[PDB]
Amino acid sequence: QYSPNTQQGRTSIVHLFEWRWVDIALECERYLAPKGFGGVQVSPPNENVAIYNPFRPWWERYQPVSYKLCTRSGNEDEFRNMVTRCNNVGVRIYVDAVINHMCGNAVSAGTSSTCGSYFNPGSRDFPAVPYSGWDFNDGKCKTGSGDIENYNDATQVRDCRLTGLLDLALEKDYVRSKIAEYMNHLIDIGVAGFRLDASKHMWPGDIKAILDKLHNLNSNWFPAGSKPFIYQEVIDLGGEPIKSSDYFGNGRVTEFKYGAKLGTVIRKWNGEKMSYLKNWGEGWGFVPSDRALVFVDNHDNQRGHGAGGASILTFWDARLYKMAVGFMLAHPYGFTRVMSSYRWPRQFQNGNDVNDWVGPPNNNGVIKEVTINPDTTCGNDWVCEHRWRQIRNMVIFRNVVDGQPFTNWYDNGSNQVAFGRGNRGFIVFNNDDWSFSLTLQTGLPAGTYCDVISGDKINGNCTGIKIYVSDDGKAHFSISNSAEDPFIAIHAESKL
Numbered sequence: 001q002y003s004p005n006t007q008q009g010r011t012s013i014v015h016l017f018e019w020r021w022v023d024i025a026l027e028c029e030r031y032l033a034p035k036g037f038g039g040v041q042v043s044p045p046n047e048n049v050a051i052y053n054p055f056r057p058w059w060e061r062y063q064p065v066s067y068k069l070c071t072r073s074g075n076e077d078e079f080r081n082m083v084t085r086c087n088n089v090g091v092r093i094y095v096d097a098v099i100n101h102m103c104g105n106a107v108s109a110g111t112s113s114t115c116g117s118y119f120n121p122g123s124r125d126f127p128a129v130p131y132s133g134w135d136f137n138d139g140k141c142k143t144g145s146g147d148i149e150n151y152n153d154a155t156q157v158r159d160c161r162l163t164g165l166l167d168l169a170l171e172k173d174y175v176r177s178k179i180a181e182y183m184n185h186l187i188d189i190g191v192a193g194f195r196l197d198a199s200k201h202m203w204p205g206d207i208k209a210i211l212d213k214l215h216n217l218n219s220n221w222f223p224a225g226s227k228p229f230i231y232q233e234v235i236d237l238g239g240e241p242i243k244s245s246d247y248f249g250n251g252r253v254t255e256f257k258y259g260a261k262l263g264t265v266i267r268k269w270n271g272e273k274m275s276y277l278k279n280w281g282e283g284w285g286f287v288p289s290d291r292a293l294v295f296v297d298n299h300d301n302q303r304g305h306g307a308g309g310a311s312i313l314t315f316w317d318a319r320l321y322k323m324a325v326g327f328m329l330a331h332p333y334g335f336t337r338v339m340s341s342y343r344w345p346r347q348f349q350n351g352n353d354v355n356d357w358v359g360p361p362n363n364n365g366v367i368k369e370v371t372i373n374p375d376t377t378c379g380n381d382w383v384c385e386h387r388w389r390q391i392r393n394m395v396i397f398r399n400v401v402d403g404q405p406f407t408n409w410y411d412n413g414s415n416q417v418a419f420g421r422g423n424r425g426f427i428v429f430n431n432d433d434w435s436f437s438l439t440l441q442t443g444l445p446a447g448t449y450c451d452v453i454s455g456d457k458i459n460g461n462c463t464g465i466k467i468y469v470s471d472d473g474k475a476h477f478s479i480s481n482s483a484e485d486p487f488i489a490i491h492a493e494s495k496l
């Protein structure tokens with residue numbers, strides 16, 4: 001469950017948040033495969049409630065009605081087509097599995113679902129699965145409201161309703177079997193793994209019981225004996241009875257302390273400095289690297305819905321965001337996930353965004369297609385951070401230095417630091433309010449290298465900054481605090 005099952009040489013997955021299946025399929029072929037991306041995390045592919053108040057919010061997809069592959073992203077045929085086409089070019093698909101619960105207990109009964117399935121939350125009736133009243137934890141929860149009221153009580157966190165979402169009785173073999181039936185269907189279609197949504201709200205043992213019912217990956221694309229990659233969403237920032245280590249036996253876990261701490265250091269909050277990142281990783285109290293799934297921001301906290309707070313960096317803070325994402329994929333710790341979002345009308349009132357519910361770009365509820373501009377950027381309000389040169393080139397940087405150790409670290413005691421990865425890569429950062437100009441030891445072979453942040457290596461030439469490494473591995477680096485990207489990165493494949 002710990003191995004991503006990505007093609008050899010690909011070290012990152014991208015979250016194509018709310019993208020349609022047809023758009024992901026051609027993105028796999030036209031960009032992800034040739035640019036070296038390892039895989040794609042897709043939005044929940046199962047039928048969900050259609051919420052019209054507010055109008056089609058992104059979170060309606062986290063309120064299941066059935067396990068039919070039928071959503072605003074597309075139908076089962078479109079989904080299968082995407083998985084086949086992506087796998088055929090070596091790009092894996094990881095599904096966001098919403099298995100802790102069904103929809104809100106207060107939602108009106110009827111057929112307001114992504115494709116007409118009838119459901120009645122009030123009577124706990126979900127005929128399209130099917131699920132009934134004795135398949136939920138209503139009689140198990142011990143809180144007065146029936147919802148989770150205190151995270152300091154590990155029992156209610158697992159047996160009660162998260163914000164009113166009907167809680168499935170995961171201890172029942174019947175329920176475990178229906179969820180496995182759904183996941184095995186996806187596995188047999190060709191998916192390489194899953195993000196277990198709201199894992200903190202499930203008992204580690206119940207999760208394990210479900211995973212024990214899962215098939216090996218499809219033998220038409222993966223080697224015999226391959227197990228699905230599992231990463232559990234557990235928000236553990238340090239002050240609760242539930243620990244992410246409790247889930248190490250089921251697979252990897254999301255390390256939310258990563259993005260929260262990185263945002264604080266890069267923003268230079270409460271006296272933090274980039275020089276403190278020399279021992280970044282377990283040294284900062286993070287989970288073991290081989291159990292960690294890291295990221296700068298996710299679909300929740302980029303809009304204030306999860307954990308991380310105001311320190312979280314996002315595409316809105318473009319300059320600092322590129323630096324954060326750059327440091328993340330240059331650093332050896334964990335398995336990296338890059339975010340890809342859409343633009344929404346952020347309206348901050350009293351410090352809070354009142355439009356944090358706005359769903360994907362659309363026309364009358366119909367999600368807009370991802371259009372590509374001549375400069376390779378996206379239109380139709382899709383941000384496509386994975387297509388930004390600075391991020392895309394760092395994704396390749398991680399592939400190139402895969403396996404190389406962390407070395408040749410340098411820092412000015414403030415916010416100017418640098419380090420290399422064996423003899424295949426070197427990266428320099430300037431986050432101080434003054435210029436950086438110094439000769440550093442890169443550990444790289446002599447030669448001329450193209451900076452992959454300011455440009456690219458095209459036709460035996462660099463379109464941006466050029467670095468010259470001498471016979472002793474030394475090289476001079478100059479970064480003004482006024483640079484549009486205050487960091488330079490060079491690697492073995494950027495050598496001229």
Ligand SMILES: C[C@H]1O[C@H](O[C@H]2[C@H](O)[C@@H](O)[C@@H](O)O[C@@H]2CO)[C@H](O)[C@@H](O)[C@@H]1N[C@H]1C=C(CO)[C@@H](O[C@H]2O[C@H](CO)[C@@H](O[C@H]3O[C@H](CO)[C@@H](O)[C@H](O)[C@H]3O)[C@H](O)[C@H]2O)[C@H](O)[C@H]1O
Nearest residue numbers: 059060062063104105163164165198200235300305306307
């Ligand atoms: C959003 C996350 O909430 C929890 O996180 C808590 C931390 O665990 C805790 O340590 C502390 O920091 O507080 C936070 C916030 O409470 C969960 O642990 C975490 O799993 C969850 N993230 C994932 C799971 C859910 C649920 O599937 C997703 O939530 C989104 O979707 C729901 C459902 O639509 C939405 O709620 C809305 O609908 C309900 C219906 O009953 C309404 O009651 C509610 O008012 C509506 O807002 C959530 O707001 C939305 O965040 C999330 O996307 C996953 O990443």
Ligand SMILES: *[C@@H]1O[C@H](CO)[C@@H](O)[C@H](O)[C@H]1NC(C)=O
Nearest residue numbers: 457458459460461462463496
């Ligand atoms: C690199 O660019 C220069 C012009 O700046 C040109 O003279 C040279 O031929 C180019 N090299 C290659 C290999 O195309």
Ligand SMILES: [Ca+2]
Nearest residue numbers: 158159167201
């Ligand atoms: Ca639960």
Ligand SMILES: [Cl-]
Nearest residue numbers: 195233254298
């Ligand atoms: Cl996540």
